[PDB]
Amino acid sequence: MTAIANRYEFVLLFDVENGNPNGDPDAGNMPRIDPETGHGLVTDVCLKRKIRNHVALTKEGAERFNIYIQEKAILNETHERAYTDAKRVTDWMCTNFYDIRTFGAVMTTEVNCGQVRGPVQMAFARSVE
């Protein structure tokens, strides 16, 4: 196993047709609008949730690709793990949970304060117009 060797930046263009891409819990579930520009807004956490769900569906409990932060799409059919003192448990979590390895996580541990950062980072998505 070896980590990636290059820095990456990506731009993703997605559209919505007659739908609510991301409701605003502070505007009666209306789609988010940017007050400064009037552009539609989609938080990063929404896209991260979608990515987590997609990977959970696609790999469905494979060896290295379990998803920790679930949203009631879980299935209890079958799980397996790599079978690897805080560093030990941190590496074990990273080595077999895709979302922890990708976005990071924070455990209730003291020595490192829990901070697992992860390489991937996403910003708020806003409408073109």
Partner RNA sequence: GGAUUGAAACGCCAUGCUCAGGCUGGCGAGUGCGCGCCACUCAUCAAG
Contact segment (CB under 7 A) with RNA among 8-16, 59-67, 77-85, 97-105 equals 97-105
Cα–Cα distance measured from residue 114 to residue 9, given in angstroms and rounded to the nearest whole number: 27
Q: What ranges in the chain are assigned the alpha helix state H?
A: 44-59, 86-96, 98-102
Judge contact between 66 and 95, C-beta under 8 A. Answer: no
127 binds RNA (CB under 7 A): no
125 binds RNA, rule: CB under 7 A: no
Please say whether the beta carbons of 39 and 129 come within 8 A: yes
Give the binding-site size for RNA (rule: CB under 7 A): 27
Residue 23 CB, shortest distance to RNA, in Å, is 3
Which amino acid is present at 108? T
Of residues 4 and 83, the one with the C-beta less far from RNA: 4
Q: Does residue 69 belong to the site contacting RNA (CB under 7 A)?
A: yes
> Which one of residues 22, 55, 64, 127 is an interface residue with RNA (CB under 7 A)?
22
As a whole number of angstroms, the distance between CA 91 and CA 129 comes to 43
As measured in angstroms, the least distance from the Cβ of 126 to RNA is 13
Rounded-to-5 percentages of helix, strand, coil across the chain: 25, 10, 65
Tokens 């047709």, residue? 17
Segment contacting RNA by CB under 7 A, of 3-11, 44-52, 78-86, 89-97: 44-52
User: Contact positions toward RNA, by CB under 7 A?
Assistant: 20-25, 29, 43-46, 48-49, 69, 71, 103-106, 112-118, 121
